Amino acid sequence: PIVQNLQGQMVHQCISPRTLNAWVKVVEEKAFSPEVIPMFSALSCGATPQDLNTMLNTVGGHQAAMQMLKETINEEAAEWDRLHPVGQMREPRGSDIAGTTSTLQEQIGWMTHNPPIPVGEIYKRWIILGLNKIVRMYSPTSILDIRQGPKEPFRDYVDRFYKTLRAEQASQEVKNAATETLLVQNANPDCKTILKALGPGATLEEMMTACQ
Amino acid sequence: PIVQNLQGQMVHQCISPRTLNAWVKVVEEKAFSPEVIPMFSALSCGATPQDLNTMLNTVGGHQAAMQMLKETINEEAAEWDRLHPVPGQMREPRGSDIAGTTSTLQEQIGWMTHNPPIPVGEIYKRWIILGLNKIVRMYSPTSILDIRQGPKEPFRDYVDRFYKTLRAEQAATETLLVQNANPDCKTILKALGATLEEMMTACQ
Amino acid sequence: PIVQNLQGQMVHQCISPRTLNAWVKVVEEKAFSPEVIPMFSALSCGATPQDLNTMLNTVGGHQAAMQMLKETINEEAAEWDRLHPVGQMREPRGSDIAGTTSTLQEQIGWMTHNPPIPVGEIYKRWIILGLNKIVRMYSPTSILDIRQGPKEPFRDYVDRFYKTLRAEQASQEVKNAATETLLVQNANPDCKTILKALGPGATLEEMMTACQG
Amino acid sequence: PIVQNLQGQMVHQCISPRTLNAWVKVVEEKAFSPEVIPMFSALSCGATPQDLNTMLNTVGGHQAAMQMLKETINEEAAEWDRLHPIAPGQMREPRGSDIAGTTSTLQEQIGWMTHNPPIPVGEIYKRWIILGLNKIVRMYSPTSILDIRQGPKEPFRDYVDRFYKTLRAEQASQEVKNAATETLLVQNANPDCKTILKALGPGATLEEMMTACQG
Amino acid sequence: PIVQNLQGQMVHQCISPRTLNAWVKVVEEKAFSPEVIPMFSALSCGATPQDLNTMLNTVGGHQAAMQMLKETINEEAAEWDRLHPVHAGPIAPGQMREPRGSDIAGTTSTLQEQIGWMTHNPPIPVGEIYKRWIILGLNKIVRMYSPTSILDIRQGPKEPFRDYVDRFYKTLRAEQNAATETLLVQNANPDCKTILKALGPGATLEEMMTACQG
Amino acid sequence: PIVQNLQGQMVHQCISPRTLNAWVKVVEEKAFSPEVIPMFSALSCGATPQDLNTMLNTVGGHQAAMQMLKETINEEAAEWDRLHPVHAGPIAPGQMREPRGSDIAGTTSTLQEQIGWMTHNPPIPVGEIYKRWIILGLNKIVRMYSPTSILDIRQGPKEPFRDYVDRFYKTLRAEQASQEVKNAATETLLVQNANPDCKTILKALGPGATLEEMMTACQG
Amino acid sequence: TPVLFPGQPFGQPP
Amino acid sequence: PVLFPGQPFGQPP
Amino acid sequence: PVLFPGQPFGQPP
Amino acid sequence: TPVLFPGQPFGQPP
Amino acid sequence: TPVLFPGQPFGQPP
Amino acid sequence: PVLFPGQPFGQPP
């Protein structure tokens, strides 16, 4: 990645083994759980297109998802070349941002220019777009199938509810609807009677306290 | 975060892999035990609102707590905007700016490094910790009134469970501690009528 | 490795214990899976020929692969010399790039000169070439023998397909010839009819969605 | 804590995850063994009152000991107030709660510690905490020194090990440990060792005592 | 070791806890396998004679190997003494005294003297000289700890060809030649024995391993 | 400890959590084996007397050895006081007060004074002097905790020669016999304590053979 | 009007 | 009293 | 088409 | 007169 | 002529 | 003879 040294200039630094290991382990352990994407974004802080490709190439399995990810990158690269037709500096095309037709020197050039062209940030945006598709596709359960067991604590039910809601990545209005209707409705009779006794417009804290 | 280098400068650094992992592990292991919040505060030293959102989003499970956290953030943000309505005057952050929702990293660094500074990172963390406190109380299994010393339980272990429960619920506390002990202890206990130290020594 | 310090100067540093241990464990755990090579290139960032040899020599097992690697290096070093016969600086031989007949000072010399002779990167290029041969060799199955099971989920089949395709590599052409024709063909009759009905131009996302049941 | 940079200046540094984790683990594993306190002093080197409170708050269990620690800190803070009831280049005088990090900001704490002459609110707070920890160690001490007797099969080395380990945990007066060393170490040794140790005569080093009873 | 600061000057630095432990574990885990030597040389990068002695003394067992190591050092130190006799007299101002064999071994030399030699201009690399002696002795130990001869390495009946080549060059490395190439082909199992040499001599190991798989 | 930063300044730093834990673990695992002492020396690189006391105090058990260590410290400190009497009088400007035995041990000296002595010109290495005393005491503990004598080492019937030589020099190391006795002990006992098979094989080589030549000849 | 609606990540722009 | 039962260390009044 | 199937990320044509 | 007494922590002042 | 030989380490001088 | 049997590495005569 590109960091700031003691001379106040933005220089290139080799990606650390600790970062390399952290990214590999979180993929082997958490697969494509929703929380993997923020971890990726954090581990790839200030990363160059080369570094981003390095992290992606270090992934062992999940080659179906990696292939889908390439297609997403291809779609976004094409759109970039459409919205950007061709001592003024040469602006990057789609392949330059993806680190395919650009070198490390050229990547540093764009990122440290004034004004900068954050090829690393643009590329990462493309990648996260693809990772969002994969997470949603690999989502095991629908929000409709989340039902509180007769012996399940309310907390463990709400946990599975919002974990599912997060992975499904539905629209904002849809998430609101599921919270209002599905959450209360699909609770066991014991909790639902208590929840309805608190009236509409009750906070989640009030709901979970009453069913503790 | 925004930290100090070896040249006496306040610059922005990426959140470190060690810090990222330490926060994930403490949530996996200790869940929302009261000692998680101080661990959170220490791991988020000098954090920007962006960094705080990163730490929160990296959490895998506990989405019930995470949703409660957002609601607490909404309340504190709404209260903030209610207390801060509308030359070389700098634009002051809204509720959403502090939460890193409508503000960029540069804007956040701008507020934090201004003179005088507007600690949007420390304000956000203040809101987050408020939410974490509620979650800790929420995940306290038993009530303080349901904590009684069994005939088999040594006095030390009983006091341990007592102040562990009291801490989770977050002040006329030890006035109740004396009542839920064994008949063996309570008799010796009333002799002084008194520090906790003396009580434990006498019941060893 | 040769890195730029906090002052902004290209200095030499000892390879870290963490880097040494990381590379050793990766080989011990992942063997010669395709993802080992990008890991190697990342761990050997800015490495000298001496550093590269250190990483290779630290490997305990897989001596058959290490020997194959030596042969590849010998080939590339010999081919380098045939393309390079002889105050001007002495250009490196094949053995110099491999760090065999060159000292650390000489290796640093070529890398920090103007213009620089990236003997580190040139050496790593030979090693990665050799590593590519080994990965392709340690590949268990041919791409032609990757066929979807009768009860195997399409996703799992696509995983095995592109995992094998990656290990095999190609000349880019064979990859493109297989990725569309072979993938759909070797799918089970039910998925095959659906995919062939979807027609060409169908994204993998569309393909996996249709055959997800 | 407070460290020195390359400009030779004392500046604030965020407490490391490694320092935090080390303290959490030593409490979980070693409980309140005597060697936990020197470990605490080392891990809190150059620490601010804020950092000290962080280390204490990260403790999950032992809440009985933590409450006792609170009381000890309160008493030492209230006493500071009772013993201590501004200039352009100086700073205000710290209260008990200021040293305890309750009513003081990080900037103020940094100010006092980096001042010239310095007001070590960190080392003062540490002092009170270690005082509290010493009381806890004494309380959690299981055995009296009088109950330490050499076993029939127990080697003299293991006996002396249990002897001074017990003596350390009891943390009594300095010269009453010497009184025990002179009147209990040899007294409570098994008959075989006790015969040889008394044969050596008073004024013998521990090295001489352990070598002689090696069989 | 002696490393380079941000100023650019060669300064002394304490050996890290991570390096100390890394050397201890690799000896505990790998003993004196051939790959331990490159690990040792890498962990002792820029090391002083004092640092080298530290790494060696931290080794618990293997005292037979250590004693053999000591000897090798004595031999190399004696030869150094022969080729570098120190002339009598006073040392000129701004100069270092000439190091003996025991000085390089860190026996009769202090840390400050070692630092003086290694950061001299031009530098006397007593650290690299001593390590050269140590590595020399370490190679002797690897050869001795080698269990099997290369002549007794033969492919099993149902043993995969790759596994056989692995054991071959693993054994060959430990004992430290064109006799290796011929020995490999001959000691192959019956089936691979035939397939191996229809391609004739001058064939790569790659061509051999692909031909004898499955 | 007092180390040199990136700007070439000899400044004081706190002991790292790694160094603290590494020292605690090596005592828990290796006890007082001979290889613990070099580990202590390396982990206490550039340490102050305060740092040295810290590492010692973090040790949980082994209080017998710790007590023996205190007595050894008392010996060397008294010997220091005898050879270095502190002259009463005002301390010259730009100078440090001359240290006593307890000053080196970090008992009667502050951290500031310790830093003062160690970074003085010329330095008074109170940290290195104290460490010399501690290591001196540790060496006594190792010899005492050495379970077997060198006389009790003889090659068994089934035991390989290498395993025997291993136990020989392992014992000899912990015994820490005088250098003069050690050389004579190896030339006399090592060959004499081998099994009748190997003992005659070493004889054919003739006296004056290297350990490499000996061990090679006794394989099988 | 609320900063964070139910179901959407932290730091999520409106 | 600077600290209270059940309240964290360094908790302001 | 920047990336082709089976080919590593950032690999030039 | 002696620096350390039995039972006394290392570096503890008199 | 060849840089590396069978059984011998990488970067091994002739 | 720089090193003798039994003595540690770097041990002065």
Name the one residue in this structure whose structure tokens are 């307890």: F102
CA distances for F164 relative to E148, F146, F161, F173, F188, angstroms: 21, 17, 5, 14, 15
Cα-trace Rg, chain K: 7
DSSP E12: E
Name the one residue in this structure whose structure tokens are 């199992």: E189
Is E130's Cβ below 8 Å from some Cβ in C? no
Identify the three-state secondary structure at position B131. helix
Chains that touch K (3 or more CB pairs under 8 A): C, E
Identify the three-state secondary structure at position C10. strand
The domain made up of B144-204 has a fold known as 1.10.1200
- Per the CB < 8 A criterion, the answer to whether H4 and H11 are in contact is yes
Q: What are the tokens at B106?
A: 């540069």
Name the one residue in this structure whose structure tokens are 């006081």: F81
Query: Residue C125 burial by CB count (10 A; 0-12/13-18/19+): exposed, middle or buried?
Result: middle
Chains that touch B (3 or more CB pairs under 8 A): A, D, G, H
The amino acid that residue E132 corresponds to is R
CA distances for I9 relative to A97, E57, F119, angstroms: 12, 48, 54
Q: Residues near E46 by Cβ (< 8 Å), separated by ≥ 6? A: C14, E1, E2, E3, E127
Chains that touch E (3 or more CB pairs under 8 A): C, F, K, L
Q: What are the tokens at C166?
A: 């990656």
CA distances for E138 relative to C14, C113, E35, E133, angstroms: 21, 36, 11, 9
The dihedral over CA atoms of E154, E160, E162, E166, expressed in degrees to the nearest 10, equals -40
The amino acid that residue C205 corresponds to is E
Three-state helix/strand/coil letters over chain A: CEEECCCCCEEECCCCHHHHHHHHHHHHHHCCCCCHHHHHHHHCCCCCHHHHHHHHHCCCCCHHHHHHHHHHHHHHHHHHHHHCCCCCCCCCCHHHHCCCCCCHHHHHHHHCCCCCCCHHHHHHHHHHHHHHHHHHHCCCCCHHHCCCCCCCCHHHHHHHHHHHHHHHCCCHHHHHHHHHHHHHHCCCHHHHHHHHCCCCCCCHHHHHHHCC
- Per the CB < 8 A criterion, the answer to whether F5 and D6 are in contact is yes
The domain made up of D145-215 has a fold known as 1.10.1200
CB neighbourhood size of E156 (10 A) = 10
Span E1-149: which CATH code? 1.10.375.10
- J10 and F67: CB-CB below 8 Å? no
Type and span of the H or E element at C52: helix C49-57
Q: Which residues of F89-115 are buried (b: 16+ CB within 10 A; e: fewer)?
A: eeeeeeeebebbbbbbbbbbbeeebbb
CB neighbourhood size of B114 (10 A) = 11
- Per the CB < 8 A criterion, the answer to whether C148 and C187 are in contact is yes
Q: Which of K4, K8, K12 is the best mutation test for C, with the most CBs of C within 10 A?
A: K4
Search chain A and give the residue with CA nearest B133: A205
Q: Residues near B37 by Cβ (< 8 Å), separated by ≥ 6? A: B129, B132, B133, B136, D57, H8
- Per the CB < 8 A criterion, the answer to whether C95 and C126 are in contact is no
- Per the CB < 8 A criterion, the answer to whether A162 and A174 are in contact is no
Structural domain boundaries of chain C?
A: 1-142, 143-213
Q: Residues near D82 by Cβ (< 8 Å), separated by ≥ 6? A: none
Taking each helix axis from N to C end, the angle separating D106-114 and D121-139, rounded to the nearest 10 degrees, works out to 100
| Helix and strand totals (H; E) in chain L | 0, 0
Residue F211's closest CA among F161, F176, F144? F161
- B49 and G11: CB-CB below 8 Å? yes
Q: What are the tokens at E198?
A: 């229809």
Q: What are the tokens at D98?
A: 């200021």
Span A1-142: which CATH code? 1.10.375.10
Q: Which residues of B175-196 are buried (b: 16+ CB within 10 A; e: fewer)?
A: eebeebbbeebeeebeeeeeeb
- D143-152, long-range: CB within 8 Å, 24+ apart, which pairs? D143/D169, D144/D170, D145/D170, D145/D180, D145/D184, D146/D184, D148/D184, D148/D188, D149/D188, D149/D190, D150/D188, D150/D189, D150/D190, D150/D193, D151/D190, D152/D190
The dihedral over CA atoms of D63, D69, D71, D75, expressed in degrees to the nearest 10, equals -170
A1-142 matches A143-212 in fold: no
Residue C140's closest CA among C109, C166, C114, C179? C166
Span D1-144: which CATH code? 1.10.375.10
The domain made up of C143-213 has a fold known as 1.10.1200
Residue F73's closest CA among F140, F11, F4? F140
Chains that touch D (3 or more CB pairs under 8 A): B, F, H, J
Chain F residues within 8 A of D30 when measuring between CB atoms: 60
Q: What are the tokens at E116?
A: 């003086």
The amino acid that residue F14 corresponds to is C
Bridge partners of A10, per DSSP, are A4
Distance (Å, rounded) from C-alpha B130 to C-alpha E43? Answer: 48
HSE-CB for D132 with a 13 A CA cutoff: 23
Q: What are the tokens at D131?
A: 């005082």
Backbone region of residue C68 per phi and psi (left: phi > 0; alpha: psi in -120 to 50; beta: other values): alpha
Instruction: Give chain E's length.
Output: 214
Distance (Å, rounded) from C-alpha B72 to C-alpha B64? Answer: 13
- The CATH homologous superfamily for domain A143-212 is Retrovirus capsid C-terminal domain (1.10.1200.30)
The amino acid that residue F144 corresponds to is M
Name the one residue in this structure whose structure tokens are 């390439």: A70
Chains F and E lie in contact, requiring 3 or more CB pairs less than 8 Å apart:
yes
The dihedral over CA atoms of D148, D149, D153, D156, expressed in degrees to the nearest 10, equals 80
Task: Tell me the pairing of strands E2-4 and E10-12.
Answer: antiparallel
Question: What distance in Å separates residue G3's CA from the closest CA in chain B?
Answer: 6
Rounded (5°) CA angle A70-A74-A78: 170
HSE-CB for F79 with a 13 A CA cutoff: 9
Q: Which of H3, H4, H7 is the best mutation test for B, with the most CBs of B within 10 A?
A: H7
Identify the three-state secondary structure at position B2. strand
State this model's resolution in angstroms.
2.6
**Nearest neighbour of K10 by CB, restricted to C56, C78, C101:** C56
Distance (Å, rounded) from C-alpha B132 to C-alpha B20? Answer: 18
Distance (Å, rounded) from C-alpha C127 to C-alpha C120? Answer: 11
Span F150-220: which CATH code? 1.10.1200.30
Name the one residue in this structure whose structure tokens are 């945006």: A125
Residue B109's closest CA among B51, B150, B166? B51
Distance of CA D6 to the CA centre of its chain: 32
Q: Which of B143, B161, B170 is the best mutation test for H, with the most CBs of H within 10 A?
A: B170
Write the DSSP string, I1-13. Answer: ----TTSPTT---
Distance (Å, rounded) from C-alpha A159 to C-alpha A77? Answer: 38
Instruction: Give chain J's length.
Output: 14
Identify the three-state secondary structure at position E106. coil
Search chain D and give the residue with CA nearest B165: D63
Distance (Å, rounded) from C-alpha E162 to C-alpha E123? Answer: 48
Chain B residues within 8 A of A205 when measuring between CB atoms: 68, 71, 134, 138
Q: Residues near F153 by Cβ (< 8 Å), separated by ≥ 6? A: F164, F167, F168, F171, F189, F193
The dihedral over CA atoms of C204, C207, C209, C211, expressed in degrees to the nearest 10, equals -140
Chain B residues within 8 A of G7 when measuring between CB atoms: 67
Name the one residue in this structure whose structure tokens are 């206490």: F44
3-state helix, strand, coil in chain F (%, to 5): 60, 5, 35
- Per the CB < 8 A criterion, the answer to whether D102 and D51 are in contact is no
Q: What are the tokens at L7?
A: 């003595």
Identify the three-state secondary structure at position C98. coil
Bridge partners of F3, per DSSP, are F11
Distance (Å, rounded) from C-alpha C87 to C-alpha A143? Answer: 75
- Measured between its terminal Cα atoms, the distance across chain I in Å is 10
Name the one residue in this structure whose structure tokens are 């025990």: D180
Type and span of the H or E element at F3: strand F2-4
Query: Residue D152 burial by CB count (10 A; 0-12/13-18/19+): exposed, middle or buried?
Result: exposed
Distance (Å, rounded) from C-alpha B16 to C-alpha A45? Answer: 9
Distance (Å, rounded) from C-alpha C71 to C-alpha E169? Answer: 13
- What is the widest separation between alpha-carbon atoms in chain E? 75
Query: Residue E197 burial by CB count (10 A; 0-12/13-18/19+): exposed, middle or buried?
Result: middle
DSSP D146: G
Please identify among residues 1-13 of chain L the ones whose CB lies closer than 8 Å to any CB of chain F.
Answer: 4-8, 13
- Per the CB < 8 A criterion, the answer to whether A19 and B19 are in contact is no
Search chain G and give the residue with CA nearest A164: G7
Span B1-143: which CATH code? 1.10.375.10
Chain D residues within 8 A of F136 when measuring between CB atoms: none
Query: Residue D155 burial by CB count (10 A; 0-12/13-18/19+): exposed, middle or buried?
Result: middle
Please identify among residues 80-99 of chain D the ones whose CB lies closer than 8 Å to any CB of chain F.
Answer: none
- Per the CB < 8 A criterion, the answer to whether F104 and F121 are in contact is no
Distance (Å, rounded) from C-alpha B53 to C-alpha G9? Answer: 8
Chain C residues within 8 A of E35 when measuring between CB atoms: 57-60
Query: Residue A188 burial by CB count (10 A; 0-12/13-18/19+): exposed, middle or buried?
Result: middle
The amino acid that residue F151 corresponds to is L
CA distances for D114 relative to D8, D129, D134, angstroms: 12, 21, 29
Query: Residue E8 burial by CB count (10 A; 0-12/13-18/19+): exposed, middle or buried?
Result: exposed
For chain D, the residues whose C-beta falls within 8 A of a C-beta of chain H are 49-50, 52-53, 56-57, 67, 70-71, 73-74, 77-78, 96-97, 100-103
Name the one residue in this structure whose structure tokens are 């104290």: F130
Identify the three-state secondary structure at position B3. strand
The domain made up of E150-214 has a fold known as 1.10.1200
Bridge partners of B166, per DSSP, are none
Chain B residues within 8 A of H11 when measuring between CB atoms: none
Distance (Å, rounded) from C-alpha A118 to C-alpha A136? Answer: 27
Bridge partners of D9, per DSSP, are none
Question: What distance in Å separates residue J8's CA from the closest CA in chain D?
Answer: 7
Three-state helix/strand/coil letters over B13-58: CCCCHHHHHHHHHHHHHHCCCCCHHHHHHHHCCCCCHHHHHHHHHC
Q: What are the tokens at A158?
A: 């709400």
Distance (Å, rounded) from C-alpha D185 to C-alpha D110? Answer: 49
- Per the CB < 8 A criterion, the answer to whether A94 and C191 are in contact is no
Q: What are the tokens at F155?
A: 């090659």
